[PDB]
Amino acid sequence: KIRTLQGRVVSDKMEKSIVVAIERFVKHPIYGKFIKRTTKLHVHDENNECGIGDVVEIRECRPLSKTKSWTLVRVVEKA
Template identity: 75%
Template sequence: MEKIRTLKGRVMSNKMQKSAVVAIERFVKHVVYGKFIKRTTKIHIHDEENECNVGDFIEIRESRPISKKKSWVLVRIIEKNNLINKITNK
């Protein structure tokens, strides 16, 4: 049996119903210069309860295709976005 792929990323958009867009960052080494470059991949995920918000750091796992673009599912929210708390100081 194959191991289920899991990734961690930051929520960029949650304007769709039961869906969100997550940005996955990775570092790749430049072939010629050897410098590590940050690359970002946007993945559409399925969020059944609409529980993740923009800026949350989440864990996702691969699943069967749910729609044309969605084949990843929300596993858990690792860290909530504290932007509102920083502005209101609460």
């Protein structure tokens, strides 16, 4: 199986692209609490179908634009 991630779309204004917010669950180094941290990845989107607020599953690939190295694989759900 190939490495991948799964996140939530926050913007689809880009043409043939989406912005995906991926939340990770990191234990704080000092205080030991498990804090939410969210990374925003510009995800390539051929066809352009994903909407704002859907759970999409993405994979790293070669660079595609200035800030787009990730791309879709499948849409987990529609929202």
